[PDB]
Coordinates of all heavy atoms in Angstrom, one line a residue:
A59 N 129.2 74.4 61.4 CA 128.7 75.8 61.4 C 127.5 75.9 62.4 O 126.8 74.9 62.5 CB 128.4 76.2 60.1
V60 N 127.4 77.0 63.0 CA 126.2 77.4 63.8 C 125.6 78.6 63.3 O 126.3 79.6 63.0 CB 126.6 77.6 65.3 CG1 125.4 77.8 66.2 CG2 127.4 76.4 65.9
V61 N 124.3 78.6 63.0 CA 123.6 79.6 62.3 C 122.2 80.0 62.9 O 121.5 79.2 63.5 CB 123.3 79.3 60.8 CG1 124.7 79.1 60.0 CG2 122.4 78.1 60.6
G62 N 121.9 81.3 62.8 CA 120.6 81.8 63.3 C 119.7 82.1 62.1 O 120.1 82.8 61.1
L63 N 118.5 81.5 62.2 CA 117.5 81.7 61.1 C 116.6 82.9 61.4 O 116.3 83.2 62.5 CB 116.6 80.4 61.1 CG 117.3 79.1 60.9 CD1 116.3 77.9 61.0 CD2 118.1 79.0 59.6
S64 N 116.2 83.6 60.2 CA 115.2 84.6 60.3 C 113.8 84.1 60.1 O 113.6 83.0 59.6 CB 115.5 85.7 59.3 OG 115.1 85.3 58.0
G65 N 112.8 85.0 60.4 CA 111.4 84.6 60.1 C 111.0 84.7 58.6 O 109.9 84.3 58.3
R66 N 112.0 85.2 57.8 CA 111.6 85.4 56.4 C 111.8 84.2 55.5 O 111.3 84.1 54.4 CB 112.5 86.5 55.7 CG 112.3 87.9 56.3 CD 112.3 89.0 55.3 NE 113.6 89.0 54.5 CZ 113.6 89.5 53.3 NH1 112.6 90.1 52.7 NH2 114.8 89.5 52.6
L67 N 112.6 83.2 56.0 CA 112.9 82.0 55.2 C 111.7 81.0 55.2 O 111.3 80.5 56.2 CB 114.2 81.4 55.8 CG 114.7 80.1 55.2 CD1 115.0 80.1 53.7 CD2 115.9 79.6 56.0
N68 N 111.2 80.8 54.0 CA 110.2 79.7 53.8 C 110.8 78.4 53.4 O 110.4 77.4 54.0 CB 109.1 80.1 52.8 CG 108.4 81.4 53.2 OD1 107.4 81.3 54.0 ND2 108.8 82.5 52.6
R69 N 111.7 78.4 52.4 CA 112.3 77.2 51.9 C 113.6 77.4 51.2 O 113.8 78.5 50.6 CB 111.3 76.5 50.9 CG 111.6 75.1 50.6 CD 110.6 74.6 49.6 NE 111.0 73.3 49.0 CZ 110.5 72.1 49.2 NH1 109.4 72.0 50.0 NH2 111.0 71.1 48.6
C70 N 114.5 76.4 51.2 CA 115.6 76.4 50.3 C 115.9 75.0 49.8 O 115.4 74.0 50.3 CB 116.8 77.0 51.1 SG 117.4 75.9 52.3
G71 N 116.7 74.9 48.7 CA 117.1 73.6 48.2 C 118.2 73.6 47.3 O 118.5 74.6 46.6
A72 N 118.9 72.5 47.1 CA 120.0 72.3 46.2 C 119.5 71.5 45.0 O 118.6 70.7 45.1 CB 121.1 71.4 46.8
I73 N 120.1 71.8 43.8 CA 119.8 71.0 42.6 C 121.0 70.1 42.3 O 122.1 70.5 42.3 CB 119.4 71.8 41.3 CG1 118.3 72.9 41.6 CG2 119.1 70.9 40.1 CD1 117.0 72.3 41.9
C74 N 120.7 68.8 42.0 CA 121.7 67.8 41.6 C 121.1 67.0 40.4 O 120.0 66.6 40.4 CB 121.9 66.8 42.8 SG 122.1 67.6 44.4
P75 N 121.9 66.8 39.3 CA 123.3 67.4 39.2 C 123.3 68.9 38.9 O 122.2 69.5 38.8 CB 123.8 66.6 38.0 CG 122.6 66.3 37.2 CD 121.6 66.0 38.2
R76 N 124.4 69.5 38.8 CA 124.6 70.9 38.6 C 124.6 71.2 37.1 O 125.7 71.2 36.4 CB 125.9 71.4 39.2 CG 125.9 71.2 40.8 CD 127.2 71.7 41.4 NE 127.1 71.3 42.8 CZ 128.2 71.2 43.6 NH1 129.4 71.5 43.1 NH2 128.1 70.9 44.9
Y77 N 123.5 71.5 36.5 CA 123.4 71.6 35.0 C 124.1 72.9 34.5 O 124.0 73.9 35.2 CB 121.9 71.8 34.6 CG 121.0 70.6 35.1 CD1 120.2 70.8 36.2 CD2 120.9 69.4 34.4 CE1 119.3 69.8 36.6 CE2 120.1 68.4 34.8 CZ 119.3 68.6 35.9 OH 118.4 67.6 36.3
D78 N 124.7 72.8 33.3 CA 125.3 74.0 32.7 C 124.1 74.7 32.0 O 123.3 74.1 31.3 CB 126.2 73.6 31.5 CG 127.4 72.7 31.9 OD1 127.6 72.5 33.1 OD2 128.1 72.2 31.0
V79 N 124.2 76.1 32.0 CA 123.1 76.9 31.4 C 123.7 78.1 30.7 O 124.6 78.8 31.3 CB 122.1 77.3 32.4 CG1 121.0 76.3 32.7 CG2 122.7 77.8 33.7
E80 N 123.2 78.4 29.5 CA 123.4 79.6 28.8 C 122.5 80.7 29.5 O 121.5 80.4 30.1 CB 123.1 79.5 27.3 CG 124.0 78.5 26.6 CD 123.6 78.2 25.2 OE1 122.4 78.2 24.9 OE2 124.5 78.0 24.3
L81 N 122.9 82.0 29.3 CA 122.1 83.1 29.8 C 120.6 83.0 29.3 O 119.7 83.5 29.9 CB 122.7 84.4 29.5 CG 122.1 85.6 30.1 CD1 122.1 85.5 31.7 CD2 122.9 86.9 29.7
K82 N 120.4 82.4 28.1 CA 119.1 82.2 27.5 C 118.3 81.2 28.3 O 117.0 81.2 28.2 CB 119.4 81.7 26.0 CG 118.1 81.6 25.2 CD 117.4 82.9 24.9 CE 118.3 84.0 24.2 NZ 118.7 83.6 22.8
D83 N 118.9 80.3 29.0 CA 118.2 79.2 29.7 C 117.8 79.5 31.1 O 116.9 78.8 31.6 CB 119.2 78.0 29.9 CG 119.7 77.4 28.6 OD1 119.0 77.4 27.6 OD2 120.8 76.8 28.6
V84 N 118.4 80.5 31.8 CA 118.2 80.7 33.2 C 116.7 81.0 33.6 O 116.3 80.5 34.6 CB 119.2 81.6 33.9 CG1 120.6 81.2 33.7 CG2 119.0 83.1 33.6
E85 N 116.0 81.7 32.7 CA 114.6 82.1 33.1 C 113.7 80.9 33.1 O 112.7 80.9 33.8 CB 114.1 83.3 32.2 CG 113.0 84.0 32.9 CD 112.2 85.0 32.0 OE1 112.6 85.4 31.0 OE2 111.1 85.4 32.5
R86 N 114.0 79.9 32.3 CA 113.2 78.7 32.3 C 113.3 78.0 33.7 O 112.3 77.7 34.3 CB 113.7 77.7 31.2 CG 113.0 76.4 31.2 CD 113.6 75.4 30.2 NE 112.9 74.1 30.3 CZ 113.3 73.1 31.0 NH1 114.5 73.1 31.6 NH2 112.6 72.0 31.0
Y87 N 114.5 77.9 34.3 CA 114.7 77.4 35.6 C 114.1 78.3 36.7 O 113.5 77.8 37.7 CB 116.2 77.1 35.9 CG 116.7 75.9 35.1 CD1 117.2 76.0 33.9 CD2 116.5 74.6 35.6 CE1 117.7 74.9 33.2 CE2 117.0 73.5 34.9 CZ 117.6 73.6 33.7 OH 118.0 72.6 33.0
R88 N 114.2 79.6 36.5 CA 113.6 80.6 37.4 C 112.1 80.4 37.5 O 111.6 80.3 38.6 CB 113.9 82.0 37.0 CG 113.5 83.1 38.0 CD 112.8 84.3 37.5 NE 111.6 84.0 36.8 CZ 110.4 83.8 37.3 NH1 110.3 83.8 38.6 NH2 109.4 83.5 36.5
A89 N 111.4 80.2 36.4 CA 109.9 80.0 36.4 C 109.5 78.6 37.0 O 108.4 78.5 37.4 CB 109.4 80.1 35.0
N90 N 110.4 77.6 36.9 CA 110.2 76.3 37.4 C 110.3 76.3 38.9 O 109.5 75.6 39.6 CB 111.1 75.2 36.8 CG 110.8 75.0 35.3 OD1 109.7 75.3 34.8 ND2 111.7 74.3 34.7
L91 N 111.3 76.9 39.5 CA 111.7 76.8 40.9 C 110.9 77.8 41.8 O 110.4 77.4 42.8 CB 113.2 76.8 41.1 CG 114.0 75.7 40.4 CD1 115.4 76.0 40.3 CD2 113.8 74.4 41.1
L92 N 110.9 79.1 41.4 CA 110.5 80.2 42.3 C 109.0 80.4 42.3 O 108.4 80.2 41.2 CB 111.3 81.5 42.0 CG 112.8 81.4 42.2 CD1 113.4 82.8 42.0 CD2 113.1 81.0 43.7
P93 N 108.3 80.9 43.4 CA 106.9 81.0 43.5 C 106.3 82.2 42.7 O 105.1 82.2 42.4 CB 106.6 81.3 44.9 CG 107.9 80.8 45.6 CD 109.0 81.2 44.7
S94 N 107.0 83.3 42.6 CA 106.5 84.5 42.1 C 107.6 85.2 41.2 O 108.8 85.0 41.4 CB 106.1 85.4 43.2 OG 105.8 86.7 42.8
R95 N 107.2 86.1 40.4 CA 108.1 86.9 39.6 C 108.7 88.1 40.4 O 109.7 88.7 39.9 CB 107.4 87.5 38.3 CG 108.3 87.5 37.1 CD 107.5 87.4 35.8 NE 108.4 87.2 34.7 CZ 109.0 88.2 34.0 NH1 108.7 89.4 34.2 NH2 109.8 87.9 33.0
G96 N 108.2 88.3 41.6 CA 108.5 89.5 42.4 C 109.7 89.3 43.4 O 110.3 90.3 43.8
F97 N 109.9 88.1 43.9 CA 110.8 87.9 45.0 C 111.4 86.4 45.0 O 110.8 85.6 44.3 CB 110.1 88.1 46.4 CG 109.1 87.1 46.8 CD1 109.5 86.0 47.6 CD2 107.8 87.2 46.3 CE1 108.5 85.1 48.0 CE2 106.8 86.2 46.7 CZ 107.2 85.2 47.5
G98 N 112.4 86.2 45.8 CA 113.1 84.9 45.9 C 114.4 84.9 45.0 O 114.5 85.8 44.2
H99 N 115.3 84.0 45.3 CA 116.6 83.9 44.6 C 116.9 82.5 44.1 O 116.8 81.5 44.8 CB 117.6 84.5 45.6 CG 117.3 85.8 46.1 ND1 117.6 87.0 45.5 CD2 116.8 86.2 47.3 CE1 117.3 88.0 46.2 NE2 116.7 87.5 47.3
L100 N 117.4 82.5 42.8 CA 118.0 81.4 42.2 C 119.5 81.6 42.1 O 119.9 82.6 41.5 CB 117.4 81.2 40.8 CG 118.1 80.3 39.8 CD1 118.3 78.9 40.4 CD2 117.4 80.2 38.5
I101 N 120.4 80.8 42.7 CA 121.8 81.0 42.8 C 122.5 80.1 41.7 O 122.2 78.9 41.5 CB 122.3 80.6 44.2 CG1 121.5 81.4 45.3 CG2 123.8 80.7 44.3 CD1 121.7 82.9 45.2
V102 N 123.5 80.8 41.1 CA 124.3 80.2 40.0 C 125.8 80.4 40.3 O 126.2 81.5 40.7 CB 123.8 80.8 38.6 CG1 124.9 80.6 37.5 CG2 122.5 80.3 38.2
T103 N 126.6 79.4 40.0 CA 128.0 79.5 40.1 C 128.6 80.0 38.8 O 128.1 79.5 37.7 CB 128.7 78.1 40.4 OG1 128.1 77.6 41.6 CG2 130.2 78.2 40.7
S104 N 129.6 80.8 38.8 CA 130.2 81.4 37.6 C 131.7 81.8 37.8 O 132.2 81.7 39.0 CB 129.4 82.7 37.3 OG 129.7 83.8 38.2

C-alpha cells in the first residue's frame, strides 16, 4: 500500500495478543492507552 499522512497523527499502535473484552472492560483499556478523555480512538473488532 501507498499512503499519505496528515499533520494530525501523533501515534498509533497494535496490541498483541488480541484480548477478549466485555463491554464492562473496554473503558479500562481506554484509560490505559489514550492520553485524554476528549479525543483519540481505540479500535475493537466485532
Side-chain angles (χ1 to χ4, degrees):
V60 186
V61 297
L63 302 179
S64 79
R66 295 221 304 156
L67 175 60
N68 297 281
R69 193 180 168 113
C70 69
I73 308 296
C74 315
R76 299 183 187 159
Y77 303 102
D78 305 349
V79 278
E80 294 172 329
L81 189 60
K82 190 63 58 70
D83 299 329
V84 304
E85 204 192 341
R86 179 188 176 259
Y87 289 91
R88 191 222 58 80
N90 290 344
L91 297 165
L92 295 183
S94 173
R95 215 154 193 271
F97 72 95
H99 306 275
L100 163 61
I101 304 300
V102 162
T103 302
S104 73

